[PDB]
Design a protein around this ligand. Structure first.
Ligand SMILES: CCCCCCCCCCCCCCCC(=O)O
Ligand SMILES: CCCCCCCCCCCCCCCC(=O)O
Ligand SMILES: CCCCCCCCCCCCCCCC(=O)O
Lengths: 108, 110
């Protein structure tokens, strides 16, 4: 269902952020607003890769905002849809800093 | 280096053909000026790809919407459809600064 799917994606993001060494090599420092489009609404999450924290909400002046459908997010996570292909297909909507978005693309 | 020259000319001719093929009145979502810097052993090739006015000019624009910095061999491969702009980004082969919305729009339409 939608709830379980959203929970799955968020758990996965939290485990990825949890696994970062805050003092080790790091390229993606900034705050990402993540908007997950679901059939029932938008799920809004703040992925703070500066502070290495993930909270539900809408951040004021995030560095990058990423808007993506829930099914597309699951497909990216499961590697059945590459980020390159998502981009070609216009499945990812961005605003903000192109530098930080590009760096994020390198590490996903 | 004749080979660098040939490579650069081919990239630019290709971009000019593509820009010239755009219907200024048909559907368009990439309304931005892109600074394109191509690294070469002879120096950085600096080109302005103006997708607002649909013009390509050699030079450095003041305050472009997006700046794209990329190596000659990688740009050639993007140009010849041997590397997608998406594979490129995933591989760290493209340095960007500027407007992420316009960058993403470019990635979709190219
Ligand atoms: C905000 C759009 C989707 C967010 C993508 C999930 C983020 C998970 C974090 C993984 C990135 C790890 C990068 C840490 C090391 C580095 O900064 O180079
Ligand atoms: C300039 C292009 C930017 C494109 C890169 C942003 C896309 C963000 C989507 C992230 C989805 C991955 C989250 C799941 C985490 C995981 O399973 O590892
Ligand atoms: C890695 C970036 C490569 C830079 C080269 C840009 C390629 C030329 C751009 C052609 C885009 C055509 C889009 C016109 C219609 C539209 O705005 O949607």
């Amino acid at each position: 269902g939608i709830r379980m799917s959203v929970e799955t994606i968020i758990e996965r993001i939290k485990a990825r952020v949890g696994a970062v060494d805050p003092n080790g090599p790091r390229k993606v420092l900034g705050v990402f607003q993540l908007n997950i489009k679901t059939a029932s609404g938008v799920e809004q999450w703040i992925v703070d890769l500066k502070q290495l924290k993930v909270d539900q909400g809408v951040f004021a002046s995030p560095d990058v905002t990423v808007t993506v459908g829930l099914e597309d997010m699951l497909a990216i996570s499961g590697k059945t849809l590459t980020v390159g292909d998502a981009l070609k297909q216009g499945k990812i909507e961005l605003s903000g800093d192109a530098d930080l978005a590009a760096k994020l693309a390198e590490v996903i």
